[PDB]
């Protein structure tokens, strides 16, 4: 088999979108409220999540067919998938050696302990770390990583989605280019596509647990006041 | 003349309230999003204003009779006076030499230029600097400074105020202790009380200009997203 020019241009647009929205230098992290090592890590991690949401919006706008959707569908997909894309894209900084996300200096080295200092419990942090480990072990090509983010965002089974048909057609076209990429470009990846689809189910379960834990902190004004307007809007329950 | 035990205990409660809420070390300023020298100073100054609002709430709760008022009246007084109290209390860091607010290191030295980098124009910054200069030249005792803040906050002529009678009785009692303090404790202050009352009128005009300029930035989501939830709530138009 061989993949078409149409499938090849989808890949080209997605890796270009990811290169424009993911700053490998982590140079903007100095602009966030500093890390502090109750809920001492909440200001810094709220700033990091807020910055990541902007990057996800930027990536989403460069996905073919996303901008063409209605503003309501664009908002529904982002409000629902935002946290899953953040967890996926965070895998680029994840280190199997330290079991932490490393973003330049030791100031931006986030371990499991720093995340408990932002209000999270091991009911979320245990499956999240186990997710990062298994994702990293997949040794995904940049092409597969970006296709997975685009498939995750363009999921039609999200609350608020009106044009299910159109969104599923965009997601199916993205799954086809992923299956064909793995088949012809990934050596010994006969089981990879199925493993990647399982990671999407794991993300749904992580989103569930994150929504529960976020609800716990958003209901305490002394904690919610530490979040950013963008985090409040995106993780909010407004329809 | 001599002032009573009741007037003396009002003074004692107010300077104690101010000492509890005004950190002369400015040690928390390191926790704000760093200063950047469009609207590069907005994150840092939004964090500084947000922190100052919390300190004003803390001061207000220690004013005799404030906590006794209804939650609605407490909110109306703070939503209306918050920016005037911030401008008053900022006078402690103001330097006549540099024509700037100095808060420890040169990182927390705010000149007129840094404030334009947060969205403000000279239509506000010119009367604000001229206000700080004249306030500093009054050489107010700590007792007078704290009484002025309490009189400013307990103004009955604010939108949303229901118990005007009660609030005016609290403000009149505060004005009486100020007049008696200046008379018996401030040498050569026969013209001071009138000069202090004029500074309150100047504050109203500064609040007007600040509300206009804040409206200009709150209506631009790319700027309003840089504010904090507490700044949005307090400077907001919700009733």
């Amino acid at each position: 088999h061989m993949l078409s020019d149409e499938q090849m241009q989808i890949i080209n647009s997605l890796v270009e979108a990811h290169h424009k929205t993911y700053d490998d230098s982590y140079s903007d992290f100095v602009r966030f409220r500093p890390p502090v090592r109750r809920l001492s890590m909440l200001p810094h991690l709220a700033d990091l999540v807020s910055y990541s949401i902007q990057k996800v919006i930027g990536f989403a706008k460069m996905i073919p067919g996303f901008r063409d959707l209605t503003a309501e569908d664009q908002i529904a997909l982002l409000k629902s998938s935002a946290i899953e894309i953040i967890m996926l894209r965070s895998n680029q900084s994840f280190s199997l050696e330290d079991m932490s996300w490393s973003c330049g200096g030791p100031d931006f080295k986030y371990c499991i302990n720093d995340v408990t200092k932002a209000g999270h419990t091991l009911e979320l942090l245990e499956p999240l770390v186990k997710f990062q480990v298994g994702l990293k072990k997949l040794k995904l090509h940049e092409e597969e990583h970006v296709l997975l983010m685009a498939i995750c965002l363009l999921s039609p089974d999200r609350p608020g989605v009106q044009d299910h048909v159109r969104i599923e057609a965009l997601q199916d076209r993205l799954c086809d280019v992923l299956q064909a990429y793995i088949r012809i470009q990934h050596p010994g990846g006969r089981l990879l596509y199925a493993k990647m689809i399982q990671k999407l189910a794991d993300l749904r379960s992580l989103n569930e647990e994150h929504s529960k834990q976020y609800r716990s902190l958003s209901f305490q004004p002394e904690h919610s006041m530490q979040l950013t307007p963008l985090v409040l809007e995106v993780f909010g329950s407004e329809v | 003349h001599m002032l009573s035990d009741e007037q003396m205990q009002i003074i004692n409660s107010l300077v104690e309230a101010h000492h509890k809420t005004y950190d002369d070390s400015y040690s928390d300023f390191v926790r704000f999003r760093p200063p950047v020298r469009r609207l590069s100073m907005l994150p840092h100054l939004a964090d500084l204003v947000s922190y100052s609002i919390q300190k004003v709430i803390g001061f207000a709760k220690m004013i005799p009779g404030f906590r006794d008022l209804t939650a609605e009246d407490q909110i109306a007084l703070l939503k209306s006076s918050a920016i005037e109290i911030i401008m008053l209390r900022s006078n402690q860091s103001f330097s006549l030499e540099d024509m700037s607010w100095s808060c420890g290191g040169p990182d927390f030295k705010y000149c007129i230029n840094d404030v334009t980098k947060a969205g403000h124009t000279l239509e506000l910054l010119e009367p604000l600097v001229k206000f700080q200069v004249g306030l500093k030249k009054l050489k107010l005792h700590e007792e007078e400074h704290v009484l002025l803040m309490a009189i400013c906050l307990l103004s009955p002529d604010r939108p949303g105020v229901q118990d005007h009678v009660r609030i005016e009785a609290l403000q009149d009692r505060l004005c009486d202790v100020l007049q008696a303090y200046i008379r018996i404790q401030h040498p050569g202050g026969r013209l001071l009380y009138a000069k202090m009352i004029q500074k309150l009128a100047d504050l109203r005009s500064l609040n007007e200009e600040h509300s206009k300029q804040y409206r200009s930035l709150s209506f631009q989501p790319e700027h309003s997203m840089q504010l904090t939830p507490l700044v949005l709530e307090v400077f907001g138009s919700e009733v």
Binding site: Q54, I75, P229 | P221, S224
Partner: peptide
């Protein structure tokens, strides 16, 4: 409402 989201989406 989604004022920020609407703005960021152009």
């Amino acid at each position: 409402r989604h004022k920020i989201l609407h703005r960021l989406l152009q």
